[PDB]
Amino acid sequence: MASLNKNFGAISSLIQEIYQQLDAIQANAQVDRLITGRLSSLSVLASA
Amino acid sequence: YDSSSYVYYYQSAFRPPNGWHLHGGAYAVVNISSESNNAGSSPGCIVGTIHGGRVVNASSIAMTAPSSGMAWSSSQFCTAHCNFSDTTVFVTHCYKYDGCPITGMLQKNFLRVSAMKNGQLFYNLTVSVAKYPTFKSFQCVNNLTSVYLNGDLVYTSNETTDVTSAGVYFKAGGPITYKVMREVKALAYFVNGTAQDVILCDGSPRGLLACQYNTGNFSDGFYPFINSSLVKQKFIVYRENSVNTTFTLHNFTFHNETGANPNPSGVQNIQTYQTQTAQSGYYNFNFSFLSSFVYKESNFMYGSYHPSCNFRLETINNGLWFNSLSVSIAYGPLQGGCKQSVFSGRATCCYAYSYGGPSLCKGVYSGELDLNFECGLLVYVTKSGGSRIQTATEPPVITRHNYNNITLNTCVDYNIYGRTGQGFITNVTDSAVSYNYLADAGLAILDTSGSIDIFVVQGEYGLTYYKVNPCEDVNQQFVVSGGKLVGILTSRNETGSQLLENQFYIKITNGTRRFRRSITENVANCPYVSYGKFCIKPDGSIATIVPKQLEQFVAPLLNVTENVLIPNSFNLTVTDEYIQTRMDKVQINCLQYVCGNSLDCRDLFQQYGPVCDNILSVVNSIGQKEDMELLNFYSSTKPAGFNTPFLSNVSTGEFNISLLLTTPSSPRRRSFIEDLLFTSVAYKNCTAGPLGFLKDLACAREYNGLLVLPPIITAEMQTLYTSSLVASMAFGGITAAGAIPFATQLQARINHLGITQSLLLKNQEKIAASFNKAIGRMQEGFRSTSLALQQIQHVVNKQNAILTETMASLNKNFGAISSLIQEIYQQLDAIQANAQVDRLITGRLSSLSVLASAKQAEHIRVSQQRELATQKINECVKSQSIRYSFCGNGRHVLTIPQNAPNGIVFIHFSYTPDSFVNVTAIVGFCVKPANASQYAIVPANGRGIFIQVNGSYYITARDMYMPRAITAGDIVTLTSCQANYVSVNKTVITTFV
Amino acid sequence: DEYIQTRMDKVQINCLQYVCGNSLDCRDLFQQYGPVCDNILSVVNSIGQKEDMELLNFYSSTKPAGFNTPFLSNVSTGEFNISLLLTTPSSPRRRSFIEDLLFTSVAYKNCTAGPLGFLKDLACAREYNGLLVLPPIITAEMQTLYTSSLVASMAFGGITAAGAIPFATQLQARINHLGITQSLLLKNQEKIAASFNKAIGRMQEGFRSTSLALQQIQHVVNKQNAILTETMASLNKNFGAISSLIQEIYQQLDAIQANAQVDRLITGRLSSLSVLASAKQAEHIRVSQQRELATQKINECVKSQSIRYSFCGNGRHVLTIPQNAPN
Amino acid sequence: AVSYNYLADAGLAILDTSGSIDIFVVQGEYGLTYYKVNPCEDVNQQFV
Ligand SMILES: *[C@@H]1O[C@H](CO)[C@@H](O[C@@H]2O[C@H](CO)[C@@H](O[C@@H]3O[C@H](CO)[C@@H](O)[C@H](O)[C@H]3NC(C)=O)[C@H](O)[C@H]2NC(C)=O)[C@H](O)[C@H]1NC(C)=O
Ligand SMILES: *[C@@H]1O[C@H](CO)[C@@H](O[C@@H]2O[C@H](CO)[C@@H](O[C@@H]3O[C@H](CO)[C@@H](O)[C@H](O)[C@H]3NC(C)=O)[C@H](O)[C@H]2NC(C)=O)[C@H](O)[C@H]1NC(C)=O
Ligand SMILES: *[C@@H]1O[C@H](CO)[C@@H](O[C@@H]2O[C@H](CO)[C@@H](O[C@@H]3O[C@H](CO)[C@@H](O)[C@H](O)[C@H]3NC(C)=O)[C@H](O)[C@H]2NC(C)=O)[C@H](O)[C@H]1NC(C)=O
Ligand SMILES: *[C@@H]1O[C@H](CO)[C@@H](O[C@@H]2O[C@H](CO)[C@@H](O)[C@H](O)[C@H]2NC(C)=O)[C@H](O)[C@H]1NC(C)=O
Ligand SMILES: *[C@@H]1O[C@H](CO)[C@@H](O[C@@H]2O[C@H](CO)[C@@H](O)[C@H](O)[C@H]2NC(C)=O)[C@H](O)[C@H]1NC(C)=O
Ligand SMILES: *[C@@H]1O[C@H](CO)[C@@H](O[C@@H]2O[C@H](CO)[C@@H](O)[C@H](O)[C@H]2NC(C)=O)[C@H](O)[C@H]1NC(C)=O
Ligand SMILES: *[C@@H]1O[C@H](CO)[C@@H](O[C@@H]2O[C@H](CO)[C@@H](O)[C@H](O)[C@H]2NC(C)=O)[C@H](O)[C@H]1NC(C)=O
Ligand SMILES: *[C@@H]1O[C@H](CO)[C@@H](O[C@@H]2O[C@H](CO)[C@@H](O)[C@H](O)[C@H]2NC(C)=O)[C@H](O)[C@H]1NC(C)=O
Ligand SMILES: *[C@@H]1O[C@H](CO)[C@@H](O[C@@H]2O[C@H](CO)[C@@H](O)[C@H](O)[C@H]2NC(C)=O)[C@H](O)[C@H]1NC(C)=O
Ligand SMILES: *[C@@H]1O[C@H](CO)[C@@H](O[C@@H]2O[C@H](CO)[C@@H](O)[C@H](O)[C@H]2NC(C)=O)[C@H](O)[C@H]1NC(C)=O
Ligand SMILES: *[C@@H]1O[C@H](CO)[C@@H](O)[C@H](O)[C@H]1NC(C)=O
Ligand SMILES: *[C@@H]1O[C@H](CO)[C@@H](O)[C@H](O)[C@H]1NC(C)=O
Ligand SMILES: *[C@@H]1O[C@H](CO)[C@@H](O)[C@H](O)[C@H]1NC(C)=O
Ligand SMILES: *[C@@H]1O[C@H](CO)[C@@H](O)[C@H](O)[C@H]1NC(C)=O
Ligand SMILES: *[C@@H]1O[C@H](CO)[C@@H](O)[C@H](O)[C@H]1NC(C)=O
Ligand SMILES: *[C@@H]1O[C@H](CO)[C@@H](O)[C@H](O)[C@H]1NC(C)=O
Ligand SMILES: *[C@@H]1O[C@H](CO)[C@@H](O)[C@H](O)[C@H]1NC(C)=O
Ligand SMILES: *[C@@H]1O[C@H](CO)[C@@H](O)[C@H](O)[C@H]1NC(C)=O
Ligand SMILES: *[C@@H]1O[C@H](CO)[C@@H](O)[C@H](O)[C@H]1NC(C)=O
Ligand SMILES: *[C@@H]1O[C@H](CO)[C@@H](O)[C@H](O)[C@H]1NC(C)=O
Ligand SMILES: *[C@@H]1O[C@H](CO)[C@@H](O)[C@H](O)[C@H]1NC(C)=O
Ligand SMILES: *[C@@H]1O[C@H](CO)[C@@H](O)[C@H](O)[C@H]1NC(C)=O
Ligand SMILES: *[C@@H]1O[C@H](CO)[C@@H](O)[C@H](O)[C@H]1NC(C)=O
Ligand SMILES: *[C@@H]1O[C@H](CO)[C@@H](O)[C@H](O)[C@H]1NC(C)=O
Ligand SMILES: *[C@@H]1O[C@H](CO)[C@@H](O)[C@H](O)[C@H]1NC(C)=O
Ligand SMILES: *[C@@H]1O[C@H](CO)[C@@H](O)[C@H](O)[C@H]1NC(C)=O
């Protein structure tokens, strides 16, 4: 649960204000990194 | 490193630590040639003379000496120079006679490595005779023009010039060796920063393992590999058109023309001043628009909009696959050309080249169309992803040749549909003209990873279907066993003299040509390398495996009268096993492990707060959870104290058990058998003083932050545990009077299988001879074929291999530019380095996560075996329960535990007799008494079936042939008998007066 | 009933042929990823050896004496219809009825040509991506005699084969150990027959609808299939990259910009192999646990009839009969 | 280290892993020596 505010290689933690600060077609790399990190955290949960 | 097959060559004066490491340089040999005693009539070679050459035009040279023999003194060694096309390099130990201005006649002087052009001298450096003790080798390398007095650099310059001659003066000594060489890849094992040996990548079977898996001193087991080599018939299948075609690619050209005016205010008011389209077949695009046209990198408003089309415009001509394609050029504005002309426009994506244009251009955007901008040409491209047209550069060479002749069942190269592979091709259309195996769109089927599984071809009487499977060497293995290579376990048949299960087997020739084929031998058990009913020795030859099993008996189950087999004599068959019971606790210091000894890297680290808490909490939890119930396990089984050595000079009766217990003369409290266990495998001062080859990795661990903690049972508190446990097994019972330390326990424990206690003068030396033969088989069994030793080996190797990969995970850089962090900030920018440092720190904390998870899994394993250990200590040692074949493949008698590497080793003693007797048996009686009554007698439980001997009648136990008169308490009275009896007219109770 | 797993399919990851495809390139870029293939190979080699040694220990501790006799259930017993439970004469495989009912709910090939089935022919899709198997140290058609020899030692162990006693006398001399006598005749002989006939009637009713072994078979087979069939479908799943296949990364864009993409993709695929090796080691710990429980229950519940109350089968047990299963 | 040929004929430092220095050399005395670098007293302190 406390793995949500922990941002990955990114610029911020919440996803509502990633699209509001910078460009459209440059934000998708940031969003892909963040979603891949959160699904890695769920993989750790299921293995434990 | 001065052998007759390679020359070493130290990579630039620093040394990476103890382990294998790879390089690339001129290391091989070709044309080894010898030479000796290049001196005249003089008693010693005079210093400073440069003559004595030998013309060699090669890409290297090397002058090597015998192994550290040629000293620098008089009558032993002189100049030994190369020369390049114009410049020379000559060493000279110019000790004084009159000649050079050095003025020294002793050792502890210097040398002269000095270059020399046609008339003058430069680059005098004077290295001491210290750090260069003995002339070993001397190279001259082509590329970078550098020269190498043994090992490191002495001189470089600018040019790239090949060696033209070389030559050495010396009076006497070892015969010197000239050799030229080529450039290969090799890797060198070196400890303490000096080379021992190298492994070349010369296509040898020993070489390929090291060159692909980056290691030597390999583990045992299997290893896959490759050797790619193919110059054979390649065949190409192009995309067939309708009918009757010669595949000719069309040429679409472009040119900047005398264009029109720039556009007015509307984004529909920009006109494409060219148009082309793709229809079918092949194409290429001649773009001559690299001439002084810069590419504009995409950003927030202006530039290209190449997302949704990952290729750049100068890379269309490589092999792509589209579905419909049309490009066109248009001279619009620059700030809002693509970002408006993609969404509301007419293209999927567009590019934006620029040039020197006049700044009178009316831009297109909602509300901002009243300014003046630049006019760079912007090309359009309308991509739709698919497979209908293919773009290629060279014209296809299949010129009026319908596909009639392509090869089958041979390892070929193939380039079909623009995807290069390497395999062979079968014919599968018999199973595919049915089952509608492809639909009405007939082309290939991709599998995963972008290869081709089934494709089609057209042009014969009917269309066929071909399948692509890889070649014979897509997965070859070669078996290593113990310490060295044995043979290649392949899939092909190169006159392979042995067939294993579903794989063919060859064997590499080791010296002599013989020892290739033999008759297989039957092995009981083998721990070496096992592969599917076949076992491979380190000798090289295989031997088939077939497991043995021992006999057992439950034999008395008696219906109608017939003689039965019960044992009279008995033997003991030993059996060992090993159970792990302890664990080394760790303590990860994350701050000192991630960053090095630096002033920085820490302020960047202090926003990685909770991940060190997460990596610390699980290690702290497993440490506490192990350390509590380890003391529970110690306090549940340590019997009473009994702090008595019992050091095996105690006089027993006839049982030689002094082999199995501790000796008086030893520095450690250790018996013989666990010493044999130890020879197969926490108080230090880490600042100064080494101990050993393997225990002194603790200083390499503690300087990287992976330290250990002592257990709650201290050292020299577990070495009394085993002795106290066997002391309670022996002394427990008797009051120590009458020569009974170990014997009486065994005889009073062996007669529980029958039904008596502690019988004397019968069954006393039979037990002695049987137990002596049992310990003889025991002392034979450990060294060659046992069960505990290989378990010890696997457990010790896994416990070492957990931690020795999270130390060698430091030089392994992640997505980064280097491994160490001290020289990331020194090479590049400040605010660009932080992404690199974040990637590297995230990778190292991922490695610590892997370490903590592996440690928790190993703790679950050892807690499982520890609770099984306390159960077996509570039952098999001090109890002798009647559970059949719980411990030691039979109804067990006694066990003796011993020490081990972080475990305990049991020695079980079974009970399996073989010699039987042939005695007649009966199942019951029904005596009739005198006046009026009737009853039967059935033998009770736990007292065994009863037999007869030569007239009388006797009961006996079910395991020991021990005749005895029937008593009154072993009967069952029943008011029935059904002629399956004996029916004696007189009573057979044998009561007393 | 109950089911206990006791075996494991050994794997052999060929990392060089799994990461890159059939290409001339991708390999020179791969040859600086040296020790990570050694790390992914060593744990698989270790679990293979550690399974393959004590599997032969488990086979040599319980295979009773030989007894290489078929005992194919036309042997005339007294009144016990046990021919439902043992093997039949007319069958291509040495298989009884009940484990055939177990099998219908769920290593010699030539992969170059010739299919076999819908599910067994995934081995050619595995071997062309570098996830191949190895045969066990007990060979095929060496485990199908194991169950028959074990029930042959449970039946014939004892008598000297004279007097129509293949299976009955073992049961009557094992049932009177709860009281205190041995092998009583002409009382308690048909009562046991009627009770055991009703018991095998409830047994032949029980397997098809409501049993305990069948769903355990289902969950174990589905997990053993689902471990490997996600690390094959992890190939088309691209990582942070531009595409999935590696043949057409070098053809679309620049040379010195493609190497970051290729490094990300290769690091992702080696992470997937790390997940595979860790899952295989955890499953080996599971099967070693159930295998040592298996040798304990073979040593006690089959050949001994100990008096431990409700160890195996919810009461003071009489006799057990083992049968084959999926692994 | 004057025995055991503890460095070869190219005498400079030995890197360990993570880019630090384990053993280096120095020159200028009667004979060349060998020095070892180990971290300070507080490289791993703990508090319970
Ligand atoms: C690639 O093609 C471009 C379009 O054909 C060329 O750019 C053209 O250069 C002309 C010469 O400078 C310009 O003509 C002038 O335009 C201005 C308006 O900004 C008028 O006032 C001038 O009278 C007029 N000169 C005349 C009529 O002699 C074109 O306007 C200009 N086209 C544009 C900007 O779209 C490039 O020069 C050409 N590059 C090459 C050949 O390398
Ligand atoms: C892969 O297998 C295919 C299936 O057998 C082969 O295709 C066969 O080729 C034969 C010879 O070219 C054809 O036989 C001809 O059939 C016609 C009409 O049936 C007859 O008039 C001809 O006399 C006969 N030729 C003879 C008897 O010599 C088969 O019809 C054809 N089968 C098909 C298309 O399904 C492929 O040739 C084979 N691949 C290779 C490389 O050999
Ligand atoms: C680290 O240990 C080194 C090994 O002991 C020290 O090096 C030693 O220094 C001594 C004094 O400088 C030398 O003694 C001299 O040896 C010469 C020839 O052997 C004699 O002629 C001198 O009289 C003698 N000096 C005396 C007795 O005062 C040792 O030879 C020398 N050992 C070597 C080089 O192996 C280092 O000094 C020491 N480091 C520090 C910082 O002290
Ligand atoms: C190798 O280099 C040596 C050193 O320069 C060359 O020796 C010189 O040769 C020229 C003409 O051959 C003489 O004029 C010089 O006097 C020589 N040098 C000395 C110091 O005597 C030698 O020629 C070179 N080898 C070849 C094959 O050219
Ligand atoms: C390397 O050492 C030699 C020593 O011989 C230097 O040679 C001297 O050069 C100067 C200038 O050319 C002459 O005046 C001297 O007579 C030479 N010394 C002799 C012949 O003994 C040479 O200059 C040095 N190289 C340098 C400093 O680059
Ligand atoms: C690693 O491999 C090297 C081979 O280069 C081993 O070094 C040999 O060890 C034996 C053991 O006595 C010596 O007889 C040889 O002379 C050594 N050869 C060289 C070139 O030094 C080394 O022991 C291995 N290390 C292990 C297995 O830990
Ligand atoms: C590298 O340095 C170590 C440290 O001295 C050497 O290890 C010693 O080896 C000798 C064998 O001749 C043992 O007698 C010593 O006890 C070892 N020292 C220890 C354990 O501290 C090692 O031999 C060196 N490697 C070489 C010279 O190749
Ligand atoms: C129990 O006591 C008896 C009686 O002392 C021991 O029997 C003696 O055994 C030794 C060894 O064979 C003989 O030499 C003696 O003659 C025996 N004594 C007799 C017959 O009176 C017996 O060994 C003891 N049991 C032990 C020590 O385990
Ligand atoms: C896809 O191809 C396979 C391979 O032929 C087809 O599988 C065959 O199906 C038939 C009947 O369904 C069986 O008799 C064969 O034994 C199968 N062959 C195998 C498993 O190798 C499959 O039916 C095809 N799918 C279709 C036509 O939809
Ligand atoms: C043990 O032997 C007796 C023989 O006395 C067997 O008893 C026979 O049982 C069958 C089946 O009920 C009867 O038809 C016979 O008449 C019995 N024989 C007699 C009474 O003499 C008994 O079955 C045997 N036990 C076994 C085979 O387990
Ligand atoms: C090869 O060796 C022979 C040995 O006599 C020698 O004569 C010849 O010059 C050598 N060739 C080279 C070094 O190219
Ligand atoms: C290099 O040396 C060889 C030695 O025989 C000679 O044949 C060749 O002509 C030489 N090349 C030159 C001087 O360019
Ligand atoms: C070594 O020399 C060859 C000569 O062709 C050159 O191609 C190669 O780049 C050189 N290696 C270096 C400079 O590392
Ligand atoms: C290489 O460097 C030297 C150093 O002065 C110079 O004289 C020479 O011209 C250079 N070679 C070139 C530029 O090809
Ligand atoms: C691999 O191929 C090379 C090329 O011919 C060959 O020399 C080598 O023996 C092969 N390795 C084997 C068969 O292990
Ligand atoms: C132009 O196309 C023709 C075929 O239409 C082809 O022969 C020729 O090579 C092409 N020109 C090129 C590729 O420069
Ligand atoms: C593109 O067209 C120009 C026009 O002259 C020609 O010179 C050039 O060779 C062509 N490029 C090709 C065919 O790659
Ligand atoms: C392999 O080749 C040998 C020839 O030495 C042959 O005798 C053997 O039968 C072959 N193995 C096969 C066909 O499985
Ligand atoms: C069993 O014991 C007898 C007599 O004690 C002996 O002759 C025989 O060799 C033994 N068998 C073994 C140890 O296998
Ligand atoms: C056995 O060894 C101990 C060790 O000191 C000694 O005290 C004792 O006297 C020895 N027993 C003998 C010599 O009978
Ligand atoms: C026990 O066996 C060892 C093995 O060599 C022997 O040295 C010792 O004398 C024996 N002790 C006896 C027979 O009492
Ligand atoms: C142990 O290490 C300490 C650390 O300061 C040092 O003072 C002491 O001399 C060492 N003891 C030895 C080398 O015996
Ligand atoms: C016991 O002896 C009898 C007669 O001598 C024989 O028929 C029987 O087979 C023997 N039992 C054995 C050898 O087990
Ligand atoms: C039982 O089946 C076997 C297998 O063919 C046969 O040999 C035997 O005669 C059969 N028993 C009968 C028919 O009583
Ligand atoms: C045992 O039961 C099966 C089940 O149908 C039956 O076919 C067989 O005849 C029975 N055998 C007997 C009663 O001996
Ligand atoms: C088995 O595969 C080999 C591969 O070369 C082939 O030669 C052989 O004909 C195949 N056997 C069949 C399909 O029965």
Residue numbers in the entry:
A (entry chain C): 836 to 883
B (entry chain A): 21 to 701, 711 to 1022
C (entry chain B): 596 to 701, 711 to 931
D (entry chain C): 452 to 499
Task: Provide the publication's sentences verbatim.
Coronaviruses from the four genera all contain envelope-anchored spike proteins that mediate viral entry into host cells. During viral entry, the spikes bind to host receptors through their S1 subunits and then fuse viral and host membranes through their S2 subunits. S1 contains two domains, N-terminal domain (S1-NTD) and C-terminal domain (S1-CTD), either or both of which can function as the receptor-binding domain. Coronavirus spikes exist in two distinct conformations: the pre-fusion structures are present on mature virions and have a clove-like shape with three S1 heads sitting on top of a trimeric S2 stalk; the post-fusion structures are the membrane-fusion state and have a dumbbell-like shape with three S2 subunits forming a six-helix bundle structure.
We constructed the IBV spike ectodomain (from IBV strain M41) in the pre-fusion state by replacing its transmembrane anchor and intracellular domain with a C-terminal GCN4 trimerization tag, followed by a His6 tag. We collected cryo-EM data on IBV spike ectodomain, calculated a density map at 3.93Å resolution, built an atomic model of the structure and refined it. The final structural model contains all of the residues from 21 to 1022 (except residues 702–710) as well as glycans N-linked to 20 sites. The overall structure of IBV spike ectodomain resembles the pre-fusion structures of coronavirus spikes from the α-, β-, and δ-genera. IBV S1-NTD takes the same galectin fold as the S1-NTDs from the other three coronavirus genera, but it contains unique structural features. Above the core structure are some loops that form a partial ceiling-like structure. The structure of IBV S1-CTD is significantly different from the structures of S1-CTDs from the other genera. Its core structure is a β-sandwich containing two β-sheet layers: one is five-stranded and antiparallel, and the other is two-stranded and parallel. Moreover, the additional structural motifs on the edge of the core structure are also diverse among different genera. In the IBV S1-CTD, two extended loops on the edge of the core structure function as putative receptor-binding motifs (RBMs) by potentially binding to an unknown receptor (see below). IBV S1 takes a cross-subunit quaternary packing mode where the S1-NTD and S1-CTD from different subunits pack together. As a result, the putative RBMs of IBV S1-CTD are partially concealed, disallowing their full access to the host receptor.
